[PDB]
Every structure is written in C-alpha cells, then in structure tokens.
Design a binder for this molecule. Structure first.
Ligand SMILES: [Mg+2]
Ligand SMILES: [Mg+2]
Ligand SMILES: [Mg+2]
Ligand SMILES: [Mg+2]
Ligand SMILES: [Mg+2]
Lengths: 190, 263, 41, 206, 113, 144
RNA sequence: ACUUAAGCAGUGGAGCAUGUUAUUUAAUUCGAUAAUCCACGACUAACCUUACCAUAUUUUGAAUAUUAUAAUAAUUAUAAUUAUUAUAUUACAGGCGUUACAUUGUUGUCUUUAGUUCGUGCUGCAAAGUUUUAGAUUAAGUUCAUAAACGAACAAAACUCCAUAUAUAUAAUUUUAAUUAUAUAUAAUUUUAUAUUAUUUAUUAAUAUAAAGAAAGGAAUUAAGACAAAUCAUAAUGAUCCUUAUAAUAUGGGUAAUAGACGUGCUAUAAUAAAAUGAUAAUAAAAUUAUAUAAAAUAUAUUUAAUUAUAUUUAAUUAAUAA
C-alpha cells in the first residue's frame, strides 16, 4: 500500500526514501499483483534489501561479473584469507557432530562398547580389569583367487580378585583389532 | 580521497587505516613501488596495535618475505567453509540479491526520465526504417537497414501509383501493398539509410513525372508474389456460416448467491 | 609467458614445462646422449 | 525454481557465452582455453631458490556478458601485516596494479572489459579439480534437510491460511513472510553443503 | 635462413606443428592477396574487354605462387593439427570435439538424449 | 510490523506491464541463450526496467528453440538455442536508448541480444578500385 | 541359455561404384601372418589435404634461455639505465623414426555383477562356517518364503530425463505455424468388481468379462576380471635413433596402373510395373543460410508454351518473417 513520508523516513535510509517516493507515485494504489510461476525473481525469504549481508551479498570492492565499482577502485588488497567469512555462528556444523577433537585406546573403546551393548560398567573395566595376551598368531586360508591371511589373538582378562575371562578375536586387517576383539570377548566371558 | 598516493598524510590516522593505505599503495604500484620516509614513520606507530616489535616491522618493511623467513596438507575439517559447488550456488543467490536490490531501489529512480509518446502522425510519417543492433557484438548485419512503406500512403495519383508499382518489380507486394527495400552495401547503417532514402526520392520523383512516361498499358506483374505465397500454407477456409446453431449454446444459469453478494 | 618478466618484474614466475625440458636435456647431457652439434654453414 | 537449491545448467560449461556472430563465439572459446592455460602457467612462484610455492587452481569459469567478461576461478595456497607474499602480489597484478595489470591486457585481447575473480579455498578436498591437481604432486543429513524444507513450506502455508482466515493479491507482504528471514531460510535450504563420499577424483557433495 | 616461407607470418597462439604453420601461412597470404586475385579474375572473365587483356590476366593468375590460392586452404583441428573429420562449428576433429564436449569447454554442447 | 513500500513488494511478484495505447511497434528485443534460467531472469529484469521507464512491453514470447546436432563415431551431442522475444510499443526513441543502455549495463552471463528499432519517418568498391589500377598498370595498358 | 532348427520378408549369377588382396610401379603412403575365417579408417585425395616417388632447394629452423652489436622509445644526463625490435649465439628446436622400444591413461571385445567387503551376533577346541535354501515367482532379479542371523556402505532398483495427455503463464493471432511456440506443474509401475481354473487355497497367479482411464513406448546412469592397441589418428611420459637429414620448402607425379581374387553398395533383367501428363498448385518432418543462400524475371539449348540445364541479374533474409 501507500505510506506517508515520515513513517518511511524513520524506518528507512534517506537515500532509499526518494526511490520509494518515485515508486509510490509510479505504482497505482489500486494495483493488483499476481505472483509469478515460471521465474522466481525474489528470494524465498523476506527482505527489504537495505543492508548488505557480508556472506549472502557481493563483498564491496571484490571484483565479479556485476561489479559496479570503477575498475581500478577495488578495495581487495590482501588475498591471504577467505574473503567472505561464514555467517551466523561462523560454523556450518551438521545437527549432530561426532568429532571429539575436530567437532567445531583399546580399553576405553572396549568399555564404551560393552556398556552400550550389555550394560557392563565402563569404570570397572578400565580401572580394575587387567589384560594379558596369551596367544598371538597368523592363520591363513586358501582361496581360488589367492591366499588370505588373518590375525588371531587369545587374551585373558581379570580383576585379580576371583573374576577371569577368556576372549578370542580374529582380524584380517591388523593384529591390534584382533586384540581389541579378544578383549571385548574376554570382558563378555567374565 | 587521495590519501594513499601522497606520502605526506599518514600522520594521525587510525592504525588499521595506515596499514590499509600501506597495502593499497604497495599493491597498486607494484614494480614502481619504492620505499618512502613517511610511510615507514607512520608504520612505526602501528607497533602497539598488533603483536610486532619495532625493529621487526623495520626489517619486514626493508626485505619482504625473506626478512621474515630469517626471523597445511590434508588438515582436519573445521566446518568453517563450503564446497566449491555450494559456493557456486551461494554466488547465484548473491547475484539474485544484487538484482533484487537493484530493482527495489534504483529502477524506481528511472521514472524521472519518463516522456510522453508523441505519436508520429500516421499519414505524414508513413515510412518505417528498421535498424538492427547486435548488442555487444561486431555483427556485419548491424549495417542492414530496411525501408518499408505501404504504397497507398505514398502521395501519388492513380497513374503515378501504377508506375511506382510497376517500377518496384519484385520489391512490391500487391497482396499486402507493401514496398520494402533492404540496403547493407555500405559499412554503417546510417549510410544505408541515406542510400535507401535517396533511392526512394528518385523513385518518387520519376513516378510523379508523367510528361514522357507511358507505363499505363503495362499490367502489374505478380509472379514473384505468386511464388512467395505458394511457398506458404493457407488457412483461408472458415467454418460455414449456415452450419452455426446458436440455439444449443450454453445458457448461463441463475445463482442467487452472487446476486445477494452483489445486491 | 615470455612477456611476463617484462610486465611484472617483482613477481618471479616459474613455468614448469620449460624446467622439465631443461632438466631432461641436462639428464641426456649427463649421459652423453646430447644432440650432435649442428653443422656450421 | 530456486537458485539456492540447484545449480544453473549454464554453470556446467566452462565458457558460458552466446553471440549472434558464431565465429566470434568460437574465437571466444579458443581465447578462453588459451588464457586458462596461461593462467595455469603463472601459478608457480619462487623467491630466489628454495621458496617454490605452487598455487593449485581449478579450471577457469569465463562468464561472458554483453559488456564485460569475468574470469572466476578457485585457488589453493600453502608479522604478515607489514609485507607482501608472492600470492598476494600475483592477485594484485591480476586486478590491482595501476599500470599493466593483467585484466587490462586481457581486455585488449578480448576487445571488451575484463575482470578476474580469484577465490581462496582453505582446504583441498572442497573442489575435485584442485584436489586432483594437488594429489598429482549422511542419511541423517538428508532427513533433516527434507524435514526442514517441509517446515519452511508449512510455515508459509500457516501464515497464508491465518492471513486468509482473518485477483489473487491477499495482503501485506510482512504477514505472508512473518517469520521467514535471512537468518533461517538461506543457509538451511542450501544444497551440496557437505562432502558425503569420495573416491580418489570424484567428490560427492550433498 | 630464419623462416621457411617468403613472407613473415606471426605464429598461431595455440598448438603448433608444421602443417598448422603452412595452413596459417596460406590463410594470411590469401587475406593479403584476395583483392588482387579477384581483380585479376574479373579482368580475365570479362568478355567485354579485349582478348589480350583477358589472356594477360589469365597468365598473371597462373604466375601467382601456391600460397595465394583460395582452394589450397584446408580446415584443420586447432588442438591436434589433424586435417580430416574437422567440425567447422568448433574447428576441432571429432575426437578433440568429443573430449572438449565431455569436459564442458564447448559452450552449449551437451550429450544427446 | 515493519513498513514495506510498493517497490520492495513488486520484487516479490510478477513484473507489472503498462497497457498499449496506440499499437505502434518501436522495438523488438530478441534474447537468445544456451540455457533458459538466466534467459528468463534477464527477461523479467528487462520487463521491470521497461515498466519503470514507462515503456509498454508485451512480454517474453517463447520462440522455437533451435537444435544443433553432432554425431561422433556412436555418441550424440546437441546444443539447444533458447530464444525469447520482448516487444516495445508507444514510446520515444530516447527512452528505448535508456532502456537498452541500462539493461546492457546490468546484463547476465551467457545471454545474447538483438534489438530491432522501427523508426517511422516522413517521406522525404575496393575491388573496383583495384581493377582500375591494374588496367592503368603498364602490364595491361601495354596491350591497348 | 548365446547362437542354431523352423516360419516370413528379402537379397543373391550381369554392368558400374567403392574397398581389400595380389601383381606391376619411380611411388603405387600406413594396417595382418602361433592353421576354421579375417591386413578392410574415410564427414568428400585434381593442386592443398599428404603421410609416398623424382628433381631442385632451407639449415638455431616453431619455442625457452644465455651472451653480444644496430634502430626505436622512456627516463636520468653526449653518455648511464631500462625495455622493445632486428641480426648473430648454442643448448637445441623438430621428427606421420622405431612397440622385434616399454609402462600408465584410456579405446573397445567377452564373462560375472541379488553380489563383494566391513561390523557385530552365533556354531565349532580350532583352521573355518554363517547354515533351512541346491527354496518359490517372473518372460527375465521383476517379485516372495524360510532360517542364527541382522545390519551399514556402494551396486541394482526406486529415482531422473525424453515421448504422450492435460493445467497455468506468455504472444497487443502481421515473425501466425494459437491446429502453434517454451517455461512451470500434474499423471501410471495403471486402479478396481466379479466369473472360471490352479494355488502355499486368500488378503494369491493365469486368463476372460465388465468399470474409471489419453496412458502405449524409450534412453541414460557401477564396479571387478579377462583379452585385443601403435591410422594408440583414443594420448602422455619415458627408452632408443636422424640432426646437409629419418628435420624443412617448391614443382610435377602417385595414392585412380590390371591377369586376376573376395567383400560393400547403386542400376537392371517389363504388365500385382515402367514411362508421359496432371497451376487457382493433393499431403510432411527435421534442418541450413556473414567464409551465404540464392527468388521472380530475361536469353539459349528449343520447339507456342511447359519441363530440364546452364547463362544474365541479385528481390528479400542473416532469419517462427525471405530462400
Ligand atoms: Mg578444400
Ligand atoms: Mg606436393
Ligand atoms: Mg597430391
Ligand atoms: Mg625431441
Ligand atoms: Mg616426416
């Protein structure tokens, strides 16, 4: 609709005021606006476009296709950094990150997985239980394409106060993963 | 605003301003850059603003990268940046916002240059010239000009008009009564416009001349128009008039709702 | 690339292809596989 | 229908141009290729010896407009206040030098105004071209995206039905978009935001 | 001594081989001598003029070197120098055209559907 | 809540078009591009510019798309030239000049233009030069 | 289950065109050879193309860099410096030289792709196995069932895009083909109600009948093996070789020669089939025209005209407009 001059003056910059005046006298008040279908000229959100958002708007002085600056008036003289920093928090984290060091050993993983899968107490596992590997070997399997090697570990865990368990673990990738699986199984077999 | 170019005026400025002016002068000058007294003295003051010793800034000013050297790959992702493709989408949206702001607050300022359309009076402005302009291109067809006129509006009597049509030959179309000429021989379009206008004056002058001219007994030739029309499809037919039966047309039906809404 | 040294004295541009060609010539030079000297007219 | 949720088919082509004079279009394509190769050659910079920096940049995007050309490209690099490093000098000669900057020479080359737009990428796995040139030397995300898009759609729906319950022009613009804003809509609706897969060079961004 | 051809011709800005260089020479010399060749052909083919002038024009046409003939210009790929299967819409052989279309170097080209 | 004047509102809607009073066709603007999104966006911007300049513009008439095809021996490649048309009516030549200059100033990538201008108005030899010179030369003049 | 066997439609003995082979040639540029058969790229080879033959003819040559003399400018002060431009300057450039000179990249040909790893869980002391199932269904992975197995990632499918049918917008119906054009959007993998026969018997298939339907086709999109390659003209790098020659230019010739041999096509061998004619012009689509296209007209073959081919002359159109 149409607004009086002062009401816009308080709510808008002075330079934009003359544009709004010419728009007011240019567009009839009885105008009917029909939404476009094929081409969406406007943004999905609502904006008065009066202020420049550093991320969502072209940086002042940055050269680009629609640079309205005089060709030798660009104000970008240090190119070391990324010119337009991220908005909001400054970060683009997903809804839940899972990076314990970058999010914006055997005993610990064993304890956590065991508490998750069976309800065993992590603290008891980490503090009281002690593991010694008993058997560590490499076992092979023939196959039509070739020979496949795997690592077998047999470990014994115990709190030295009457609880003892035996665990066996297999891993084609590495012996450490086999020891991890053996520790897991031994904790399960206490 | 000519602060960067003259070395004299760095004194008293905010530290970031001295630093930005220093960067500006160095970047703009490039190879022609040379050390200056006042820029160094101003830079001496910038030691407090950032973590730099005074001799260190002297050294860095004097000998660039190497002075500083004398004094990463596959890094973890901090979720502080976008991919290139997402940045392309953000650039698209930046362009969209630029155009939206432009339409919002500068296009309303182009109404001050409106002017009313003084229609060229149809009878006394009968000749239409077509000029073409390929914007942002060096296209040879930008030199073509087309002069077209409906032959009736030409000021001519029956014998003179018949002579005009006879001498037009293939340039005249009897069905549409249009005389059209195309000129692209000269380099510019203005030269072709002058050429077409002069040929029109010659044609008109010698058509209006009937003193020693006897082209009344020559029938108008239309074989070129016949061929041109023969190379097009025709939809001349129309639904027979007597076949129409308006009796079966839909009859609008009374609905009291709009009657009471409007009265 | 030849023109760059004239245009931008401060910046020192390394064209990798010419460096590779020169190093290859040196490698053939080291083993005595270099081209025979062109006959002087 | 939205420029934050899709990539323009124009952006597929490196040289995006249309000229009525097809010969000029072919000439512009050839010029884009040659200038891209030259830009590639200029990306290595040594200071004396044992200081050989190698900037890895993707292929150039030549945006041809009626009155201007814009050469957009992404690049990777790697007391800093008081001096200039080689890459900064390179960019400043791309655009900022007063006398013989590169864009003026390219303008004389193309016979139209030219600008160059380098953009820094702080990582190497944010662009397939840069990643390949360097090494030469998710269901939760989708669920959140679809549900949030539904949230914006239903929010506009709620605003419109409320405005109706209180031609096709309905009412003031603010009520139509009462809560929709720059803070919430744009970043949420953007696509290709995260790298969800890779195979060393094909990088899948979703 | 310094250059293969009688007249100095500037080097093409892209891929170079011997046949591309010969093509460029003939192209540029055709540019320079087009008007002269056309005038000679006019004087030779104009039956209004005396027969002696026509024969003189024909003999002068025969005397011209090969790098002035219009027919001798052949379109070659600007990326590999091949002379066959050259598409004039891009001045590329079918293989280079294929690779450039796949990589997106050619404006507007796409895969068929 | 916050006042939003008519200019900002008009951005969020289809471009307004002025009615044609007389019917004189002063300018035909043909936009062609190899993609359509930039094409239609630029057409919409031209419509807004024409409205604010007082120019009655009909609209972007879709014209037949041209298809160029190539075969690689058996891979098929093709290029689509999309073409739009905008016509201007009942306005002075100077206003057309302002329109064209402004929209050229803020053009979009990959879109080419042609502007045909209709101006209603009142009723009122390198080879040849060379041939004359050769005929004067002492290799042809010696045969007279 | 490729492929075969069957049914149908053909083609198939001659001439020419176009390839390969043999032979000849100064060259007839290049391609295969471990016993079925196979040397076989042409989006146009008179010159150029061109790579081959003959005869002359060029020697840092096509680029990068070095070190020097000449002119041009810019500055300082004729000289100093910078650059540019020539002439030399030698590393070399160059090479359609070599695969009996190799390795990647790829280019294709064939097979397998409801399958391969990983994570847990379970069985066995263990190497290992992951079980019924070596299941059912379809025309086929298209679909189910079971069971110590269940997951995620790719792949497949869905999905996507064409075509089709509609809706909105756009076009001042003279750029008119509104029967059209191109943007957005919707639609289907069809949905149902019964009858009969089978059925793991219903909340299932085969059909058939009825009802709402415009709805009936298509392409692309992944990896793993294995073979073949140098017209690998689908390239790069390296190895080796020539450097008055295997590099480079010009004139002409050849790639078109014919005893033959085999492929590929065109024209024929007559009446279910050829020829002539058919102006208010029976009826299309997709293209192309600034390195163009060429309308109508006049003239000659030629003859009242028509047709057909050239000649003269360029009308419009650089294009939803004219050709
Ligand atoms: Mg030719
Ligand atoms: Mg020859
Ligand atoms: Mg030949
Ligand atoms: Mg070599
Ligand atoms: Mg050779």
């Amino acid at each position: 609709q149409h607004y009086d001059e002062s009401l816009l003056s308080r709510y808008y910059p002075e330079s934009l005021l003359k544009s709004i005046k010419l728009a007011q006298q240019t567009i009839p008040e009885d105008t009917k606006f029909r939404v476009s279908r094929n081409v969406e000229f406007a943004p999905p959100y609502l904006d008065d476009f009066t202020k420049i958002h550093p991320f969502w708007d072209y940086k002042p002085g940055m050269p680009h296709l629609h640079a309205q600056e005089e060709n030798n008036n660009f104000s970008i003289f240090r190119w070391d950094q990324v010119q337009q920093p991220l908005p909001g928090e400054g970060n683009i984290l997903p809804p839940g990150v899972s990076l314990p060091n970058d999010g914006g050993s055997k005993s610990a993983d064993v304890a956590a997985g065991l508490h998750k899968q069976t309800g065993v107490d992590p603290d008891y596992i980490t503090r009281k239980l002690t593991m010694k590997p008993l058997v560590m070997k490499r076992v092979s399997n023939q196959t039509g394409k070739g020979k496949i090697a795997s690592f077998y570990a047999l470990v014994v865990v115990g709190d030295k106060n009457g609880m003892v368990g035996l665990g066996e673990g297999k891993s084609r990738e590495e012996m450490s993963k086999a020891i991890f699986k053996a520790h897991w199984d031994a904790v399960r077999n206490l | 605003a000519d602060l960067y170019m003259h070395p004299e005026k760095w004194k008293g400025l905010p530290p970031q301003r001295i630093l930005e002016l220093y960067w500006e002068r160095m970047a703009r000058l490039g190879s022609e850059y040379k050390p200056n007294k006042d820029e160094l003295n101003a830079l001496l003051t910038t030691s407090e603003y950032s973590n730099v010793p005074v001799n260190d800034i002297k050294k860095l000013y004097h000998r660039g990268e190497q002075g500083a050297i004398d004094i990463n790959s596959l890094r973890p992702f901090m979720f502080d940046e976008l991919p290139s493709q997402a940045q392309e989408l953000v650039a698209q949206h930046r362009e969209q916002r630029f155009y939206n702001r432009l339409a919002a607050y500068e296009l309303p300022l182009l109404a001050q240059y409106r002017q009313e359309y003084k229609r060229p009076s149809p009878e006394s402005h009968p000749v239409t010239y077509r000029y073409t302009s390929y914007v942002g291109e060096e296209h040879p067809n930008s030199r073509k000009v087309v002069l077209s006129v409906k032959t009736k509006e030409l000021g001519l009597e029956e014998k003179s008009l018949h002579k005009f049509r006879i001498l037009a030959r293939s340039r005249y179309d009897h069905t549409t009564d249009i005389f059209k000429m195309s000129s692209d021989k000269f380099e510019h379009a203005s030269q072709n416009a002058r050429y077409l206008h002069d040929i029109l004056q010659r044609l008109l002058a010698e058509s209006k001349d009937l003193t020693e001219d006897d082209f009344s007994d020559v029938p108008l030739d239309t074989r070129h128009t016949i061929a041109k029309s023969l190379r097009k499809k025709k939809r001349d037919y129309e639904f027979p008039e007597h076949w129409k039966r308006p009796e079966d047309a839909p009859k609008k039906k009374f609905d009291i709702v709009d009657q009471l809404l409007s009265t | 690339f030849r023109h760059l040294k004239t245009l931008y004295p401060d910046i020192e541009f390394v064209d990798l292809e010419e460096q590779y060609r020169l190093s290859m010539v040196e490698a053939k030079k080291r083993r005595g596989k270099g081209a025979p000297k062109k006959m002087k007219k | 229908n939205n420029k934050l949720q899709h990539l323009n088919n124009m952006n597929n082509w490196n040289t995006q141009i249309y000229n009525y004079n097809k010969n000029m279009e072919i000439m512009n394509t050839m010029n884009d290729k040659l200038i891209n190769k030259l830009l590639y050659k200029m990306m290595t910079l040594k200071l004396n010896n044992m200081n050989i920096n190698k900037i890895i940049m993707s292929k150039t995007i030549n945006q041809h407009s009626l009155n201007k050309l814009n050469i957009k490209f992404y690049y990777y690099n790697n007391n800093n206040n008081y001096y200039m490093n080689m890459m900064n000098k390179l960019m400043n000669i791309m655009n900022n030098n007063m006398n013989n900057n590169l864009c003026n020479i390219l303008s004389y080359y193309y016979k139209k105004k030219v600008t160059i737009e380098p953009i820094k990428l702080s990582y190497i796995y944010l662009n397939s071209d840069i990643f390949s040139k360097y090494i030469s030397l998710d269901h939760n995300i989708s669920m959140n995206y679809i549900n949030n898009i539904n949230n914006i759609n239903n929010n506009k729906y709620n605003n419109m039905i409320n405005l109706l319950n209180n031609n096709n022009y309905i009412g003031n613009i603010n009520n139509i978009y009462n809560n929709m804003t720059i803070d919430n809509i744009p970043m949420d609706i953007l696509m290709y935001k995260y790298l969800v897969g890779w195979s060393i060079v094909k990088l899948n961004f979703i | 001594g310094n250059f293969r051809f009688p007249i100095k011709t500037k080097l093409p800005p892209g891929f170079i081989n011997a046949r591309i260089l010969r093509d460029n020479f003939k192209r540029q010399q055709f540019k320079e001598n087009e008007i002269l060749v056309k005038s000679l052909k006019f004087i030779a083919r104009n039956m209004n003029l005396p027969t002696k002038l026509r024969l003189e024009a024909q003999l002068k046409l025969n005397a011209l070197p090969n790098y002035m003939r219009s027919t001798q210009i052949k379109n070659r790929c600007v990326d590999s120098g091949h002379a066959r299967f050259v598409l004039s819409d891009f001045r590329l052989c079918r293989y280079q055209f294929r690779e450039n279309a796949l990589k997106g170097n050619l404006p507007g080209v796409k895969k068929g559907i | 809540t916050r006042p939003y004047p008519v200019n900002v509102e008009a951005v969020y809607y289809a471009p307004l078009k002025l009615p044609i009073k007389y019917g004189d066709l002063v300018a035909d603007i043909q936009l062609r591009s190899y993609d359509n999104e930039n094409l239609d966006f630029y057409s919409d911007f031209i419509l807004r510019t024409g409205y604010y300049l007082g120019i009655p513009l009909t609209g972007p008439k879709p014209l037949p798309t041209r298809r160029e095809r190539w075969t690689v021996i058996k891979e098929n490649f093709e290029r689509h030239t999309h073409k739009r048309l905008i016509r201007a009516w009942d306005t002075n030549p100077e206003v057309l000049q302002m329109l064209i200059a402004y929209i050229t100033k803020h053009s979009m990538a990959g879109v080419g233009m042609k502007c045909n201008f209709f101006q209603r108005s009142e009723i009122s030899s390198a080879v040849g030069q060379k041939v004359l010179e050769l005929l004067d030369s002492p290799d042809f003049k010696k045969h007279l």
